């Protein structure tokens, strides 16, 4: 099977090859596209196939396929999953696979970048207090002074599922959410339960509109546990606009590192639970989603007043000049503390130029439109010209439920 | 089997039942999504299921399901097929077989007006001077002096598939293309192909920027032939912006009557290849699409300019700064020039209550979100938040390559 894709701009067509190496389901069917829907212990018997899968990914990837190491390195997987039911990857498969992870995430759009991240092993993480310094250890790293790297932090792997590394919270650093009384929400409505959930664990809540979360993370499959991360570490930017002197007393403020915390990370057959992993933002992430989504700050309302724009009709299109306005803020204001941003064009130009290289080296590129497209101005991007192949190779990231309607809480 | 789509700016979940009624396929697989993919005769034993399929939803849709009116049409369309080959719709079939492709068209933002549609019935059209002729009566009808109406114009079926009825243009109104010695465009660079096509049939080009192509139209498989619409059916609006007195010296217009006439119209079967709709358009269409693509008419540059906005980065969003503002000129002057026209917040906030009433009427509404999502402010708009679910239903509207591919001359 060949599969092509056309630039609907430039006219350059693609073949994709590499959708024959793709096992799991999509969600779609002949009948149905689910393209746009969010959500669309394993035995000894089904861990060997993914196992050897994943070894000769590797092995082939060092052009060592077929060696003698690629050999004994099957037959000593094999002897430690019928002994023990499952075995351990050795490092440099680790990186391997954390990296391919990255380089697979179809909704990614910063992946020219996949080849560059830094794998910190946490596999012999044995407790809470553990992972809390190994989380503020990757946020001093990543964080580097505004000098963004991207890095993953690795805690030890599903065991039995009664055991399992969790991080709670859904990005190491996201400020918390206040429902008040009069149904109005202080702060950010996005982290409302989680909020709730902190200070029922004994968190005592400033109650402002940007209080960073305190960790809550679960090792071996016990309770979690709250920790401050050190304020020092949490580089934050206040947002200002170059133009507009009045700006910055919306008392807009954000933080410098995205750090996602709530994957999954299946290497080989094996699940690591608990992977922090992080890179650097995109503008319109805060500018766009973080800042003017009706359920998350919602602040179009105030920005378009302070402009003087004419708010009685949406065909002025006030909130469209707000909204670019508002992103004009946020990439100035971190450009302006020295803190690593993209903008939209520039990351969606650079994901054309490395979808085109996947496709000439790797036979394709899977990649998920709807997510790709950025939240604004979609079309003056390449990318919103562009028709994608959507499909899930391993290793892969992949979305689990909240763990507090999971957890066995054993008090 | 029971699909569910929930929107997560409002936690409203909705149950989709109507998909068990699909029928064609998506190009998806239970392997690859082909969701961004642009482009993813009938014998005697096959028309029948098919005209039965429709006939039992009309007759459904008039709360006459398993009458002895039901059983008789369904007798007649029978015998009508195994002695003709093929079969003739009623008015009243025809009309609500129309309506339901447009109700059925997943990739439309503006199916709230699907049941308000004027159709045409100009299946006794016989040659091309014909439809020239219910071409300029139904530009009439759907301009209306400004106020525009929904209108669809349907031309003889398909027989045995060599005497086919085509508009050749892809739209009943579209600005001609030319290349120049210099090596660029003139006009609209989507039209340089068909432009060619109609100065080689005998069309005087003007040479000009704006330049109303002709119809090139095809009846009963014979070869197309050229006509002009009348200048003065051809209503078009100036573009000037609220705020800018430099913006109207661009020189740019564009019509008020959005018109597509390259689709098949697939209804119980029976297959009808000139079918030309209208509607009136949603402001990004040409705002953000026709004068902003770099492939169209391409205008970022000389408007962020003539703003002074910095262009020495990309950082600056000098380019959404100046789509915003192209945008706003667009509305402005078709609301100065009473000329239907509506914005991207309000179509798509109509496009979500009807969604919330086709899953509440008819269990469900199947949606494109890559072509419903507005190409400009896509996450301001309630439809980015909105999950749906593609399916194909019929009667359907189905895409059809250029005739001038398919022709002999
Ligand atoms: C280097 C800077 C990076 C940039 C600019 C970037 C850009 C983005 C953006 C804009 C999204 C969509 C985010 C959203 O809408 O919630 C995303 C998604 C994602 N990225 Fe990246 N990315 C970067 C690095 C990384 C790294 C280091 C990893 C993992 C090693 C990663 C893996 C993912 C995954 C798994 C998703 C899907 C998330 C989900 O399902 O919620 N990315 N990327
Ligand atoms: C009443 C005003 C209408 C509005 C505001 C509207 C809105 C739109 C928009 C914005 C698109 C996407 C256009 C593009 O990006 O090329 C579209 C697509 C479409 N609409 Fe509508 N629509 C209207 C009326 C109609 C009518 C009257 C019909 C048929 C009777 C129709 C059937 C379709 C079909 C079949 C498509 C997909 C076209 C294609 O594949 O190129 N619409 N609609
Ligand atoms: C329901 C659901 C499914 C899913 N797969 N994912 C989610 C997280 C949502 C996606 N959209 C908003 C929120 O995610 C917010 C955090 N996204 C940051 C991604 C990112 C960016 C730059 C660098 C990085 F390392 C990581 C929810
Ligand atoms: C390759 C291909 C496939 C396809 N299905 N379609 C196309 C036409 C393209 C789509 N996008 C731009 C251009 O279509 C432009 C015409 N679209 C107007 C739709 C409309 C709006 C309001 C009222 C109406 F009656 C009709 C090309
Ligand atoms: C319903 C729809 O799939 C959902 O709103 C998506 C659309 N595209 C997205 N794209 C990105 N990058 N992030 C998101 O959260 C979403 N949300
Ligand atoms: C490749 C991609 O499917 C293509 O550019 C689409 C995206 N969404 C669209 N949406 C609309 N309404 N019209 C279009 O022409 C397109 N083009
Ligand atoms: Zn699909």
Same mark, same amino acid.
């Given at each position: 099977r060949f599969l092509k894709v056309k *630039?609907?701009? #430039?006219?350059v067509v693609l073949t994709d #090859? %590499?959708? %024959?190496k793709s096992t799991l389901? #999509?969600? +779609?069917?002949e009948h149905i596209?689910?393209? &746009? $829907?969010?959500?669309p212990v394993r035995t000894k018997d089904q861990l060997f196939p993914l196992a050897k899968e994943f070894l000769d990914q590797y092995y082939s990837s060092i052009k060592r396929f077929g060696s003698k190491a690629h050999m004994d390195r099957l037959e000593e997987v094999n002897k430690e999953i019928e002994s023990t039911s499952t075995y351990q990857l050795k490092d440099t498969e680790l990186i391997y696979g954390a990296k391919h992870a990255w380089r697979n995430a &179809?909704?990614?759009?910063? =992946? $020219?970048?996949? &080849?560059?991240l830094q794998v910190f092993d946490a596999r012999d993480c044995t407790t809470a207090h553990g992972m809390f310094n190994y989380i503020c250890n990757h946020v001093k790293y990543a964080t580097n002074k505004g000098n963004l790297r991207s890095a993953i932090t690795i805690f030890p792997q599903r065991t039995d599922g009664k055991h399992d590394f969790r991080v709670? *919270?859904?990005?190491l650093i996201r400020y918390a959410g206040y429902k008040q009384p009069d149904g109005s929400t202080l /702060?950010? @409505?996005?982290?409302v339960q989680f909020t709730e959930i902190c200070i029922q664990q004994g968190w005592k809540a400033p109650? /402002?509109?940007?209080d960073v979360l305190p960790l809550l993370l679960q090792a071996n499959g016990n309770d979690p546990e709250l920790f401050q991360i050190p304020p020092e570490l949490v580089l934050e930017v206040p947002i200002r606009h170059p133009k507009f002197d009045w700006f910055k007393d919306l008392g807009l403020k954000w933080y410098g590192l995205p750090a996602v915390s709530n994957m999954l990370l299946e290497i080989g057959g094996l699940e690591f639970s608990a992977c922090p992993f992080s890179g650097w933002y995109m503008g319109t992430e805060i /500018?766009?989603?973080?800042? +003017?989504?009706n359920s998350r700050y919602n602040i179009l309302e105030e920005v378009a007043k302070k402009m003087d724009?004419?708010? =009685?009709?949406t065909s002025s299109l006030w909130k469209d000049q707000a909204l670019v306005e508002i992103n004009i803020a946020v990439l100035y204001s971190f450009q302006s503390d020295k803190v690593t941003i993209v903008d939209h064009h520039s990351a969606t130009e650079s994901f054309i130029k490395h979808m085109e290289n996947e496709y000439r080296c790797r036979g394709g590129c899977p990649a998920d439109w709807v997510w790709i497209? @950025? @939240?604004?101005? /979609?079309? $003056? #991007?390449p990318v919103f010209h562009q028709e994608m192949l959507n499909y899930r190779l391993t290793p892969s990231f992949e979305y689990q439920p909240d763990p507090w309607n999971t957890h066995v809480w054993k008090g």
């Open positions: *630039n609907w701009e #430039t006219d #090859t %590499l959708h %024959l389901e #999509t969600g +779609c069917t596209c689910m393209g &746009s $829907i969010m959500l &179809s909704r990614c759009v910063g =992946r $020219i970048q996949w &080849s560059k709670w *919270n859904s990005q /702060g950010d @409505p996005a982290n109650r /402002g509109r940007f /500018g766009v989603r973080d800042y +003017c989504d724009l004419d708010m =009685r009709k497209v @950025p @939240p604004m101005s /979609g079309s $003056i #991007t």
